[PDB]
Subunit: 111 residues, 5 copies
């Protein structure tokens, strides 16, 4: 169980409104985290309040976990600090259409 | 007394200007916190300085505890960092009408 | 000497350009602090760079201690982090006219 | 192996879209870091979302590591906090044309 | 060698483009620091990207050490965190004309 700070980036767009921060099955048993850093914008981003949420469970119920909200007219960027995500965790777009570049650091363990 | 980091979100709008971050009575005896993260906006938000306050007591007097202030024209979002709220705690809107999406992390203990 | 985290708010306006964060004389002997959090705006705030300063002494000389600066046209809010004020400490408005809502946390000791 | 906090600055422009934060070969064996601080803009900066990325490897694949994004119309500056870069590391401009002044602190060891 | 947290402020303007954070000769032998906090603006500030740099030496060469950059049109204020300056250290204005109010905390030792 040795550390690697493998940086990570993903895209939430119209045809990728839902995405998964995922670790392979043989590696899920180890301590894996995601230090979330920053979100940028693409060309097709709608000029409205794009909202990025975390999707996990609620004791058997569906849940959206608010993470970020932006709009290129006044807020092209948002600063979220202090979130460590343990895979698997779903990214979802509550509002807007994307694309949004979500960048963080996959802290992974490898044998 | 085991930890759960149950994420949480609430809505402060015209008919919900006052809301309560509350833990059930059988669970109040344990160490419960609320890591406050972020606030977003809804459709009916008035374009003025919405102000979100904490309501607790003042040695027998009513109190508003300033937490956030925003306005979608120039400040659609506000970044509040370092606030842990122990339930029960009231959310109140000092100015504006809402809606405002208040998101944080209910750190709860369960037996 | 037991702690209380008594939250606090004050108003710096035209007729209250100078204000005092003060602890009663029987309680000055204890460790008292002020975790400064946030500043909001009132109705009569002039649309120019309001500046909030701390007033203490300079080995026998008067001093203004820069703390915050804002203007509702582009900066309705300012984020000051890391300031603990030991009472008595004066709030002064170097520029502008107010009103400004200064909110923080009086960490007080009581017997 | 003694520390020096040698401050550092570089320019990413049209003819310098790729740059290298590099330490000399005789000094690579020591613990070298780069506390990244701030990015400013030049005269020829295009008024669009300039994006600065880190270039390293992906287990044999090319990678861009999102670091900053700005645009002088609304975001002339970006605040990136918490990044320590161990040389050699490539700076690349994913979008835009520059120039961009990237400033940080080369924490270097010398014999 | 006893501590004093003597707060400090200085002005970088057209006729004061260069300034010195200095400690008296009889006191230079002690551990002296400057926790840099904040920069505000004056009346004669040009509406362009004012840049504040630190001036020290480069193994016999002149150096400018980027610290802050602002412009009252979109960035009337800049938030620089984590800089402790040991006197003597020169403040210089790389771009712009000032005035700029630089405020921090001279952590000084006195016998």
């Amino acid at each position: 169980e040795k550390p690697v700070s493998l940086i990570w980036g993903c895209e939430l767009n119209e045809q990728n409104k839902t995405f998964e921060f995922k670790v392979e099955d043989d590696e899920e048993k180890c301590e894996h985290q995601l230090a979330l850093r920053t979100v940028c914008l693409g060309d097709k981003a709608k000029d409205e309040f794009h909202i990025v949420e975390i999707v996990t469970q609620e004791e058997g119920a569906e849940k959206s976990v608010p993470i970020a909200t932006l709009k290129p007219s006044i807020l092209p960027m948002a600063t979220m600090v202090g979130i460590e995500l343990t895979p698997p965790v779903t990214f979802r777009l509550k509002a807007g259409s994307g694309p949004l570049y979500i960048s963080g650091q996959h802290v992974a363990m490898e044998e």
